Specification:
CATH superfamily: Winged helix-like DNA-binding domain superfamily/Winged helix DNA-binding domain
Number of helices: 5
Number of strands: 2
Helix content: 40-55%
CATH topology: Arc Repressor Mutant, subunit A
Strand order of the largest sheet: 1-2
Oligomer: monomer
Structural class: mainly alpha
Order of helices and strands: HHHHEEH
Shape: globular
Length: 97
DNA sequence: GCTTAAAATAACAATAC
DNA sequence: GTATTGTTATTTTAAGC
């Protein structure tokens, strides 16, 4: 059902798409599932997968189980670094792996 | 044809409520 | 006690030499 793809890319865009300086792991899961149905169909653990490609890359700060996460109500905050490491490049989705 | 790197995936673990 | 997130580590895939 279609091959896999770079999540970091979708992530970088998920964060970039939000220049408001804010993001939510859950929100992303929705933004992705909303974008890709197949992904929301199989969802072979897009939790760690996303969160992985989400954190493992940008290297930002997130908020764990807070007093305002009834189900999937969390908050993720990223510093002005992701857009920095990106702007520098030119949307390289590999970088001579 | 082989190895190396990075990307992608999965499982657990820790905190918080 | 339960629920949500976070962190780590392992795996797999694909491209680099």
């Amino acid at each position: 059902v279609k091959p896999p793809y770079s999540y970091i890319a979708l992530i970088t865009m998920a964060i970039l798409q939000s220049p408001q300086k804010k993001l939510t792991l859950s929100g992303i899961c929705e933004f992705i599932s909303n974008r890709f149905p197949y992904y929301r169909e199989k969802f072979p653990a897009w939790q760690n997968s996303i969160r992985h490609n989400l954190s493992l890359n940008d290297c930002f700060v997130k908020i764990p189980r807070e007093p305002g996460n009834p189900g999937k109500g969390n908050y993720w905050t990223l510093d002005p670094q992701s857009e920095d490491m990106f702007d520098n490049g030119s949307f390289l989705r590999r970088r001579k792996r």
